[PDB]
Ligand binder design. Structure first.
Ligand code: MOO
Length: 231
């Protein structure tokens, strides 16, 4: 048959490699749809036919669970990640530490801070939480360059349309055109976690085979290579 995976945008590269490998060794076609975790959860709620859902936060998985769209016994935290600040590869921007007294205004210099839309994209929600805890939010809000998902934010920095952008550590590994210039302290935000679950009514042997593969060694190898931490 064919499996349909709805996965957070930050999983783009890893999921494509995993799908390729699974087809080589098991013969099944895996089709992935990538977007903000919020967008995917709402599509699943509406009735879009996804078999698996992997969210970049617990919030949007909880959302789908409440709408009775998830086979709950299958829900499990699969990956972890870090929150970082990236700059264009060829930028002269130097490394910096992030604390209560970081001078964001000087760092930006009339430029905007690329972020996933803090209204709903997990990467933006983690970022807003961190910036509010570090007291930088009030200063930064009028200087944001929001995007549809974390990869949209990444693109803004790669195309040098924003001096800095807040993305996941894994995004930096996948990107050929940016560099990590700072890392948020773990205590500034909720732990970045990626729950996976089978969509209600799609728990059959074919989907289950893929779900099990995601927790196996071949997949763990690919996830690690892309900067994700395995839970
Ligand atoms: O759902 Mo994302 O990976 O925070 O854009």
């Amino acid at each position: 048959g064919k499996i349909t995976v709805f996965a957070a945008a930050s999983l783009t590269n890893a999921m494509q490699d995993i799908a390729t490998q699974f087809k080589k060794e098991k013969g099944v076609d895996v089709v992935s749809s990538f977007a903000s975790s919020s967008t995917l959860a709402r599509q699943i709620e509406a009735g879009a036919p996804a078999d698996l859902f992997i969210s970049a936060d617990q919030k949007w998985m909880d959302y789908a669970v409440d709408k009775k769209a998830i086979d709950t016994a299958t829900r499990q935290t699969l990956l972890g990640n870090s929150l970082v600040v990236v700059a264009p590869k060829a930028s002269v921007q130097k490394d910096f530490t992030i604390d209560s007294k970081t001078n964001w205004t000087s760092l930006l210099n009339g430029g905007r801070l690329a972020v996933g839309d803090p209204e709903h994209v997990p990467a933006g929600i983690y970022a807003k939480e961190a910036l509010q805890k570090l007291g930088a939010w009030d200063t930064l809000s009028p200087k944001l360059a929001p995007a549809e998902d974390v990869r949209g934010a990444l693109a803004l920095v790669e195309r040098n349309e924003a001096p800095l952008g807040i993305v996941y550590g894994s995004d930096a590994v996948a990107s050929k055109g940016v560099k990590v210039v700072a890392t948020f302290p773990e205590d500034s935000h909720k732990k970045v976690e990626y729950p996976v679950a089978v969509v209600e009514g799609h728990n059959n042997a074919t989907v289950k085979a893929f779900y099990d593969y995601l927790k196996g060694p071949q997949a763990a190898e690919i996830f690690k290579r892309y900067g994700f931490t395995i839970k």
